[PDB]
């Protein structure tokens, strides 16, 4: 749904910098650089899995802090859905058919892969010639702003993410890296 | 295969890196291809391609010949030690005398 606060489209994109902060290693300024037609639905694709805590809204998402992510390699793409290819016992509920769909506490597979800890809408595009900050192929159209903001996941869900890693007792295996 | 110095360690193999090479009879990637992505389009909005990229090798001495430096590395003074056995000297010495 349409509400009432306004973000820029760079905050979907984690590599672009956003309000406060620093934008060094990318040089943009927000509401003047935007995103082409395929660079917003990948930004929306990156949405179920590497949804990071926040500040206030610290509710991050199925998985909260985001661990490593680890699946089976191939040379095809048709290929590669081969190896990864685990159905389960069953296929839990869309969550992208249009129905917000307040389940129970226990979710299934199409409702765990889909899931949109935000609400999102995407403003019309803008006629001109610029490329977009990410890909930079020139284009007719961008997307300059959208409608974010912070929606907590019930507490004490049951979810096993496929191809999640976890230490002893759920708790995401994120990287230590610094 | 330029060297530097006297005692230099040499690599029995050279790894080399080349791109892959159409034809139309191995028109699909090999298996032991992989995937870069260096192949530019524009530079002020960065845009880069992949490009696949095969791996070969090298032996020194069947392909490649071990060259050798030029000039001099290390310095030295001279330090001409004093001799008064040469001619040049002993014709030097009865001059100045
Ligand atoms: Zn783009």
């Not at chain 2, 690599?11 to 034809?23: A, T, Y």
Request: net charge negative; aromatic share 8%; proline share 9%.
């Amino acid at each position: 749904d349409p509400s009432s606060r306004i973000r820029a489209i760079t905050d979907l994109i984690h590599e672009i910098p956003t309000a406060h902060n620093l934008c060094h290693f990318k040089h943009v300024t927000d509401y003047i650089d935007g995103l082409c037609e395929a660079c917003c639905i990948k930004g929306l694709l990156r949405l179920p899995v590497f949804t990071t805590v926040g500040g206030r809204g610290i509710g991050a998402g199925i998985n909260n802090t985001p661990p490593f992510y680890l699946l089976w390699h191939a040379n095809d793409l048709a290929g590669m859905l081969a190896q990864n290819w685990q159905p389960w016992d069953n296929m839990g509920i869309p969550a992208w058919l249009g129905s917000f769909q307040k389940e129970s506490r226990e979710v299934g597979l199409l409702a765990g892969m889909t899931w949109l800890p935000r609400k999102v809408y995407l403003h019309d595009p803008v006629p001109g010639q610029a490329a977009c900050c990410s890909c930079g192929l020139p284009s007719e159209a961008l997307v300059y702003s959208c409608s974010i903001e912070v929606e907590p996941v019930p507490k004490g869900l049951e979810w096993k993410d496929p191809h999640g890693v976890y230490t002893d007792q759920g708790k995401s295996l994120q990287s230590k890296i610094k | 295969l330029q060297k530097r110095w006297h005692n230099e360690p040499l690599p029995q193999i050279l790894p080399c890196v080349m791109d892959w090479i159409p034809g139309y009879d191995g028109e699909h990637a090999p298996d032991d291809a992989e995937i870069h992505y260096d192949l530019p389009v524009s530079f002020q909005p960065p845009r880069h391609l992949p490009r696949f990229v095969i791996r070969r090798e090298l032996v020194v001495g069947e392909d490649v010949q071990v060259s050798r430096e030029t000039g001099t590395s290390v310095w030295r003074p001279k330090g001409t030690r004093a001799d008064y056995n040469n001619s040049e000297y002993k014709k030097v010495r009865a001059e100045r005398l």
